[PDB]
Structure formats: C-alpha cells, structure tokens
Design a protein around this nucleic acid. Structure first.
Ligand code: ZN
Lengths: 315, 100, 248, 189
RNA sequence: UGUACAACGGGGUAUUGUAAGCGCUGAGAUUAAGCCUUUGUUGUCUGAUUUGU
RNA sequence: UACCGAAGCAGAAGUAAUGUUACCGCAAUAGUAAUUGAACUUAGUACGAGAGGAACAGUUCAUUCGGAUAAUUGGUUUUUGCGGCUGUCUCAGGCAGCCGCGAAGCUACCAUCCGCUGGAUUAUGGCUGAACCCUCUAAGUCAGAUCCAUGCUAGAAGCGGUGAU
C-alpha cells in the first residue's frame, strides 16, 4: 500500500553547473484521458507522415508557489536536512495541510515565525549565509494551489523540488528573491520534452519513464485544446465537463499514454532523470486534431456549436 | 483526415470515432456510434425511421478535382462558411416555426 | 557419424577424383564404415583423407560437363576474364583446374585450362568434358606438330588452332569464334523534407499548413476557387431572406 | 536510358514507382541509392515526388495516368491529393475517379495518345484527352507498349518495370534478354 | 458565521425513438441508481474526549 | 543464446510508546529483469573463377512477460434504463414476463502508453620488464561479461529540520 495519497520522488537528475537555477519536477491532478491523432513524422517508418491515432492522458496542473528552501549536508550517513526556512507567509490551504481537525482547531498556524520574519531579517539572512557557505545541495519547498483546481479535496499537497543549477549561492539568491512567488507550469516543462510519471494506482506506487508531453496547456487562453490544424475555439474539456472530475480552468499538461492512478489523483512529473538520446525524444510532436466529444455516454458531437447541426434545431 | 457523413442519419463522423469494418465486398460503413451501426445491421429502414435525418428531411420535419489552396482562395472560405451556416440555421428555424 | 557421408558426393567426377585424388582410396574410406570392453573395442575400431578431399572440393570450381566450355601462352585464361593463373612458364604449373566465366550474346561461357597424375587429370578433363580443345602458342617443327599428331584421338572436341597472342584483339577474336563454334558444333535518420520540391503559383506560401478543418468541418468542402462572387451571392440571398419578410 | 534498382531488396520496382513524361511518383523510403539512381538519370527535368496512396506502400498499382494528367483512386487521402497537386506542375491536371477497387493500374493503362480500361472510360478519355479501347500485365507509352507473352521471367510486366518516353527502369532480377526485349519493344535504340 | 458544507432551482451532458393523450413530438421519459456545472432559494455551524518542553 | 581462440574459416554464413501532534525529508536495509525474433540502409559493396553475399555504426517493427489505462473496440448491463409487445382487471402495457437499442462498470495482448547507463573483474587481446636472450608476469600496466554501482518498490513496530502551548 502507498504511504499517502501523494507519492515521493525517490531521485533527481544530475545537477548542471552551467545551467541557470530552475525547477526539476512538477505535479498535478489526473484529468482522465482523451483521443488525439497526429502525423507520424518518424523517419524510416512504414507509416511516415501517416495519421497515427493514440490516446493521451490529461493532468490538471494548477500553479505551484514556492514556500521554502531546504539544504542538505552530505554526511557519511546520507543527506541530512541542515535547516528548513519558510518565507514569511503560509496560505490558508497550506496551513490546512498541518491540521487533521482544522475546523475544530484554533487555526494557530505560524505566528511567532511570521512575527520573526517581521524582524530585520538578520536571522533569515544568517541562515541564508549559512546555506551559502554550508551544504551545496538545495531543495525547494512548494505546494499546489488546490484553491483554483475544482476539486472537493481543498487540501494543498506539499512537495519538494530540487534545483538543477550551479553555484548554490545563486540557488539561495534565487530562493531569496522567488520566495512566496507563483511558478507557472510552462516554466518547468515544454512541448516535445520527455518526462516520467509517478503516481499511485487505483493502491501501489509505480514509476514510468520515457513519456513525452504531447501538449503544454496554457489555461489562460481559449482554444487550448485545438491544434494548428483544427484551431477551433474549443477547450480540452468536452461538453458537460469531465467524468468524475469538475472542470479545467487552469494550466494543464497532456502526456502520451496513461499515468497511473484514477481521475482526481495527484501525480508528479520529472525530466526522465537523464538526457535520452533516442530519436523519438528529439522529434517534435505536431498535433492535427484533439477529441473533445462528450466522454460521458457516447457523444455524437464535439461542441454545442456543432451539436445542433445534426439535429438542425430542437424544441 | 476526412469527416464522413453517417449515411444512416447524415451525421458527422469525426476522426477516431465510429466503427468501419473493412469487408471484402468493399463498401463504406459510416456511423457515429454503435446505435447507428446496429440499426443498419438490423436493417432498420432509415428512410422510414423517425429519429434519422434520412426520413425527417423528406417527411417535412426538417428542410472530383483538387484545389491548390492559395491564401486568397482560403480567405474567401472564412466568410463563406459563416454565411452558409447562418443561412442554414435561419432556414431550419423558419421550417421549425412553420411546423409548430 | 553418418552426417559426414551425406555431404560427400558419389560422369566426369568419377575420373576427376581419380587424378586429383585416389578413387580406390576414396571408395574404400567411404565403405569402411560394465562397458569397458565394448568401449575399448569401439575405440580400437585414413580418415584425414576424407577431410582433405572435402576441404579441396570446398573451394574447387563447380562445372557441368554438359555446359559450354572452352612466351606467355598460358596467359590466355588470365587475360580473357577476371581469373588468376600462375605466370611460371613451365607446363606443370597448371595442376589446379583454372576456370574463367564470361557472358557471350547473353549466354554464359567459360574457358578451362589445365605418366604424371597432372597429365592424367588434364586428359580426363579434356575427354570427359564437352569443352573444345585449343592450341595457342606464340611465334621447332616437332614441338609445334606434337598437338597435331595427337589430334585424332580427341578430334571429336571440335579442335581449333590459333597462333600468333598477348594482343587483346586476338583474344577477343578467339573468344568470339569459340563461343559460336561450341553451339554450331546517409540512411533515413531524419524526416523527409518536401519543401522547395513542389510547384506553386508563388513562393509566398510555400511553407503551407493546410489545416483541413475549420469550424468543426473539413476545409476541402469549402475550398472552392475564387468564390468571392459566391460570397456576394450568398450575401444577396441573406438580404433577400431578411427584407422579403421571412424573418420580419 | 535503362535503369536498374532494388526497392529495399525488392525485385518488383514498378509496384512502388510510377513514371510519366511530366512527373514521377515514388514511394517514400530510407534508401538513398534507390532515389539517387532515379534522380541522377532524370536530373531535375521532371519532379520526382515522394508520395503515397491511402498510406499504402505500393503506388504503381494505385496510380495510372499520362503526361496530360494523373488519376488518383477514391481511397486516396485528401492530404495526399493536395500534396500531389502541389508537387505536380500547373500544366498537369489531376482528377479523382470513383472505383470499387482502389488498384486503378490493375485494369487501366494509358499513354499520351491512347488509353485502356463507360462512365470511367469517358472520364479517363476526357481527363487524359486520349482514345480508350490488363493493366497489371500491360505497359504503354509513346514508344509503344509491352504485354505478357521481366525480372527473371516474371509474368507481371506492369509491376516489375516502369518506363517513359526517355527513361526505363527494371528490377535487378531482369536478365540481358529481357533488357534487350524491353529496348526493342520501346525502340530505345 | 461565509462566493465554506448539504438539499432544492436552471443549464449542459449520456439511453431513447416520438410514452399516455389530443402536428404537439429527437418530445417527454430513467435522468443517475457508478455524469458535471452554475445564475436563484433554503438549513448548517456543537459535543464526547486524550496528550504536551 | 553473448564474448574469445583454433580451423583452406575466401565470402556467404574456452568463460558465461519516544515531550504530544502534524508536515517535509535522509536511508542501513529486503527485492530487482525486460525478454525472443524480425526488416531498412554502407547492401549489390569488401570478399569470389560463380553461384552467393557481409560487418563495427544509425534506423523501424513484431511475440511473450512486468507497471498502469479505460480516450475507444470488444467480452459486457440492476443504469434492469427508452420504445414496443402478451395473460390483469379496473389509459398502468402494470409485475413476479420477452424483445431492438443501452450509458456506467469489472475487464482484454480481446485494446492502448512505457519498460536502464557508469565502473572492477574470469577467459581473452597487449606494453614495459627478471628468474633465464625471449616472454602479458615475477613487480607494474591498458582494453575486456560475473560483480558493484544508476533507476525502481517498501522503509528499522534508525535518523534530520520545521509549526503550535
Ligand atoms: Zn450516424
């Protein structure tokens, strides 16, 4: 059985001294599956340029904000958490994660620590300098903005993301500046990038690697579910919403295959832990058409705009 | 892709949907869901069944070469599609109002 | 054990194996085919000769006696085609069965060249095969007439005599004569790029996309040519539908 | 004049190739020598279009036409038809034909002056602008035609080889007598 | 003690082929028993009880 | 089945409860694997009198098995759903009945997505160099698969940091 509803990242990719400080993983909530068709541009294949049809999963990825940073000392008995530091503020759902009886409890969340941050910062700057001189491996503390995702969970899942940049002084400087900021989904992953998926099945946790992101969903603009070919004013959400899921109104990610876990389950993504040299990873996934028919039942129409076309008109 | 019209009900057949078994007799089998496919298999007469456009259009319930695809040619289609859709919708609404 | 005999063959070959090898020895070798006493008897119960002949035939030329076949006098086989023959002038250098393949008039032809065992082998290869017998020499009476004196016993081979032959034209003429007389007697690693490989009215839209779907329907149905007139007609029809009273 | 090539070790080259006096059709593949041989002899005089029919590897059976125009089978995808139209010059027409069997070349053979197979016959005559009277066992061009009595005696003349007014192609299995027969019937010499 | 929770209201979303009755009528009907949302209405918010440098 | 050596081996083709609670974490440790075959280019080229036809490298697939999925196809249905129909009498086609269609579901090789990369070594290929000129071996030393690492699953009814009085 899994330890909790959320899964734990057991490894991180090798650090890069030259690259800038950036996040290594992202997490979201499963949003079912959808059908897609694309041109198979793979060279040396008997189906070159053919319209290959396959299923792609959809995961809701609300914005994730940084809430703290943690450094770890390379001790002879493994990595030890040198010091954890939160940034001046904890969200309502962030505080809720620390209570089993939040409604009954007095909601006495960070009070002296918040008051401590109101001081001249010397203590916080002292800890930052400590981390700068001391342990040179740093992990960021973040949470999911479940307040935006339309789920009854209403509880933010805390998670740690390791920075892959060099000059850990730059790491702490970035943390010092990007504290309590919101990180968009597109800032961690991009289209055609190969990622791995980890989640909990319908109850064991398992990891699957070599999964390509078919599309990165910017949920702020319309027609996010329409490709360059279809380019219709349609969202990935079909008519009536989703099966056992509320709605998509924020950033989302589309991944080849089916991530483990039923709908509404939280999942995490990572950049394959290494630089895959396969030509499949390198090739770009041009998109032709994305299915938006009502999954609930058997939808004979894509959107209500064209639904009346078959019937012409209705009472 | 090629969105066919379901011959049983003159309904769209979007990519990835429907069933078309390639029989040796070489016939088109266009359908939108299992309902129409089974109705065709059952030989339910579309020309005399109320819920299919084939019968409704006549009963009074409702009303070879390629193109080079130049920028100017497609530019005309943008307005033509909207005009045709509006005309068809208005005609259908008028027909329904007359039927009422 | 029996697998060895299966791969060993058993009319020219019968005498060919009797000069390049020993026929009687070969036949004898082929036909000579709690438990301590039995094991010793089996162990107690010339085999290298079979392996030697197998190795020799493994690279020897394969020819059918019924197929068409035909100083520097020995350089004819080397010059006629891509065949190698020892340049040593002494006669006995031709122990091996040298063969050279070539095509004449879309038909396969080949030349063959070859008492001591070598002499018997050559005699058998001449008599048993359908190949013609030829006498080539560069420009003494007794030496020259030796072949003619022995001609009668193998005259059935349609003998031909040509004498000067290092010049290539002579070799070509000899081959042409003999051939007629015989019958008379990188890879795909990236997607294929089609850009600039197709024609268009202009290159402005060479990088075409062709979405093929608009407003939920295929563009191919609406992609009529220069239908601005049709759009104007549709606008006129809409005006006539609105102002005539259909939707007053 | 004549050419010899192997389509990924295949002996029948006409199945995956089609030649005319104004355009050429060849199935997509990863063999650089196969396309290089066609390009070197034909140069850039005519467009050597990398294309497929209905996604199938074979194109000779499906495609039949002349220099005036090209006829595509019903099952051809619209994208393939658009790509062919773009690749073919404006002087060459393209027309779709409704046929039960997608293999147009199995029963239809034609050249710049004559054709063979009445709705389809008249359509071919109009599109190709030629008179119309065995496609798999026939080959026709302006240099005459060849029919069954190539590729070591293969009886399918219309599949093993393809030829136009100035270029002939045959499989590697073709023998010298077959090459001579092809040259004589098409009066290359 | 407030766009928080639950039940109602509308809408969209699936099964259907035109229930009974007098063209209504791809209407109505199961309508979620393994669908969703939202624009209106109503009620909700207090005990048992254990631990702590 | 992989790697080497002999072999007229031209080409084709021996080794193996813890100050409570809650959150975020480390990992000594236990388990661990992908599997079998196919097609394309160099490929009609090295080889060879000809039948015959490579390879280091780069690509595309298929069978079995492992982790998941139901976007949708099927096995399928207490949505006993919509419509129809026969006993039951005063339109309900009632209900312990049948039929055409049927979402939702468990589920399939009956479908879909994925299924490892760095080092030390046996044999082996070699350098320097004595016993005793030589020699891969005596002292040193490069390459190289069984082993160890990477990743994956769980976490000692072991450990670090953080909030609340
Ligand atoms: Zn239909």
């Amino acid at each position: 059985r899994a330890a909790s509803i959320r899964a734990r990242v057991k490894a991180f990719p090798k650090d890069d001294r030259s690259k800038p400080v950036a996040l290594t993983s992202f997490l979201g909530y499963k949003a079912g599956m959808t059908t897609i068709v694309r041109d198979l541009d793979r060279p040396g294949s008997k189906f070159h340029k053919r319209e290959v049809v396959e299923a792609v999963t959809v995961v809701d990825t609300p914005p994730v904000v940084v809430v703290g940073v943690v450094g770890y000392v390379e001790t002879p008995r493994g990595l030890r958490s040198l010091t954890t530091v939160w940034a001046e503020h904890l969200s309502d759902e962030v505080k809720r994660r620390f209570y089993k009886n939040w409604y009954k409890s007095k909601k006495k969340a960070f009070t002296k620590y918040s008051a401590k941050y109101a001081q001249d910062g010397a203590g916080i700057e002292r800890e930052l300098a400590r981390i700068k001189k001391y342990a040179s491996v740093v992990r960021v503390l973040v949470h999911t903005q479940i307040r935006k995702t339309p789920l009854a969970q209403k509880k933010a899942h805390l998670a740690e993301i390791q920075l892959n940049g060099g000059s850990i002084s730059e790491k702490v400087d970035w943390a010092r500046e990007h504290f309590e900021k919101t990180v968009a989904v597109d800032s961690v992953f991009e289209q055609n990038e190969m990622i791995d998926a980890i989640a909990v099945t319908k109850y064991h946790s398992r990891t699957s690697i070599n999964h390509k992101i078919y599309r990165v969903g910017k949920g702020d603009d319309e027609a996010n579910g329409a490709t360059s070919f279809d380019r219709t004013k349609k969202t990935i959400t079909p008519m009536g919403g989703f099966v056992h899921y509320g709605e998509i109104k924020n950033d989302f990610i589309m991944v080849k295959g089916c991530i483990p876990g039923n709908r509404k389950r939280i999942v995490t993504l990572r950049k394959s832990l290494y630089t895959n040299t396969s030509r499949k990873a390198l090739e770009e996934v041009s998109l032709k058409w994305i299915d938006t028919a009502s999954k609930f039942g058997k939808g004979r129409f894509q959107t209500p705009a064209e639904k009346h076309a078959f019937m012409g008109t209705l009472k | 892709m090629r969105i066919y019209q379901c011959h049983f009900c003159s309904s769209p057949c979007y990519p990835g949907h429907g069933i078309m078994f390639v029989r040796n007799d070489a016939k088109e089998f266009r359908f939108c869901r299992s309902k129409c496919h089974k109705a065709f298999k059952q030989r339910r007469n579309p020309r005399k069944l109320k819920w299919t456009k084939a019968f409704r259009k006549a009963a009074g319930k409702e009303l070879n070469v390629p193109v080079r695809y130049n920028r100017e040619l497609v530019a005309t289609t943008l307005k033509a599609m909207a005009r045709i859709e509006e005309i068809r919708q208005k005609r259908e609404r008028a027909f329904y109002k007359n039927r009422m | 054990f029996e697998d060895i005999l299966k791969g060993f063959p058993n009319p020219f070959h019968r005498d060919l194996m009797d000069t390049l090898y020993e026929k009687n020895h070969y036949k004898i070798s082929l036909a000579a085919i709690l438990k301590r006493a039995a094991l010793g008897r089996m162990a107690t119960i010339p085999l290298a000769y079979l392996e030697q002949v197998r190795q020799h035939i493994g690279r020897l030329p394969s020819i059918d006696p019924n197929t068409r076949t035909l100083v520097g006098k020995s350089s004819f086989l080397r010059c006629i085609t891509k065949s190698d023959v020892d340049v040593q002038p002494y006669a006995f250098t031709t122990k091996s069965l040298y063969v050279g393949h070539f095509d004449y008039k879309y038909l396969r032809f080949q030349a063959i060249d070859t008492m001591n065992n070598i002499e018997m082998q050559s005699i058998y290869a001449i008599a048993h095969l359908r190949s013609c017998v030829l006498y080539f020499m560069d420009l003494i009476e007794a030496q020259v007439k030796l072949f003619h004196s022995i001609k009668p016993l193998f005259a059935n081979k349609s003998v031909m005599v040509v004498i000067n032959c290092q010049l290539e034209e002579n070799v070509m003429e000899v081959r042409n004569k003999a051939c007629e007389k015989l019958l008379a007697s990188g890879a795909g690693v990236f997607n294929v790029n089609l850009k600039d490989k197709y024609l268009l009215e202009d290159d402005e839209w060479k990088n075409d996309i062709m979405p093929e779907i608009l407003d939920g329907k295929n563009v191919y149905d609406f992609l009529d040519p220069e239908i601005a007139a049709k759009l104007q007609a549709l606008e006129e029809e809409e005006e006539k539908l609105e102002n005539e009273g259909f939707y007053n | 004049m004549a050419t010899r090539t192997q389509f990924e070790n295949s002996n029948e080259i006409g199945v995956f190739s089609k030649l005319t006096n104004t355009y050429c059709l060849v199935a997509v593949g990863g063999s650089e020598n196969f396309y290089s041989a066609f390009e070197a002899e034909l140069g850039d005089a005519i467009p050597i279009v990398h294309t497929t029919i209905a996604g199938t590897r074979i194109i000779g059976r499906m495609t039949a036409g002349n220099r005036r125009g090209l006829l595509v089978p019903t099952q051809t995808t619209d994208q393939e038809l658009q790509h062919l139209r773009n690749s073919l010059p404006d002087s060459v027409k393209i027309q779709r034909v409704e046929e039960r069997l997608s293999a147009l070349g199995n029963v239809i053979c034609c050249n710049d002056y004559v054709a063979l197979v009445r709705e389809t016959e008249e359509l071919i005559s109009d599109v190709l602008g030629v008179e119309v009277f065995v496609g798999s066992y026939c080959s026709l061009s302006n240099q005459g035609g060849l029919v069954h009595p190539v590729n070591r005696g293969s009886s399918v003349v219309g599949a093993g080889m393809v030829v136009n007014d100035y270029l002939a192609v045959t499989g590697l299995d073709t023998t010298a007598p077959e090459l001579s027969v092809i040259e004589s019937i098409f009066r290359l010499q």
